[PDB]
Amino acid sequence: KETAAAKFERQHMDSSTSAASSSNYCNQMMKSRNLTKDRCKPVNTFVHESLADVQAVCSQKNVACKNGQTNCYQSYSTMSITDCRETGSSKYPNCAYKTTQANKHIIVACEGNPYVPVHFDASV
Numbered sequence: 001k002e003t004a005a006a007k008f009e010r011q012h013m014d015s016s017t018s019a020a021s022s023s024n025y026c027n028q029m030m031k032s033r034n035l036t037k038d039r040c041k042p043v044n045t046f047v048h049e050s051l052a053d054v055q056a057v058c059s060q061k062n063v064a065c066k067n068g069q070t071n072c073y074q075s076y077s078t079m080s081i082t083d084c085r086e087t088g089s090s091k092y093p094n095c096a097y098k099t100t101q102a103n104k105h106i107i108v109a110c111e112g113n114p115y116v117p118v119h120f121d122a123s124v
Contacts, residue, residue, distance in 0.1 A: 026097035
């Protein structure tokens, strides 16, 4: 079974590419990471930093989560990310996405022992 930590890695980690991300990227990645299986996931972010660097965020700046919980953390440095946002013409099962690269501080929710990212909350 898939742990919360594993689910975060599947949904939000892509250390294999530095940034770039072609115009095809989100279309390919949203499908390959199984985020278009049950529906088109509307918004999803991939982080192009090492797993160690993203895991490290759980020891960085404590901030309020969007849902009001207190277990979110903002990265001290900007990170290379790709936001995937479902187009207006996208229709399941043919989910279509806009691919946008950015360099921003990420905010993740952390849980467990070891204390690791389990939710991607925002970029700022």
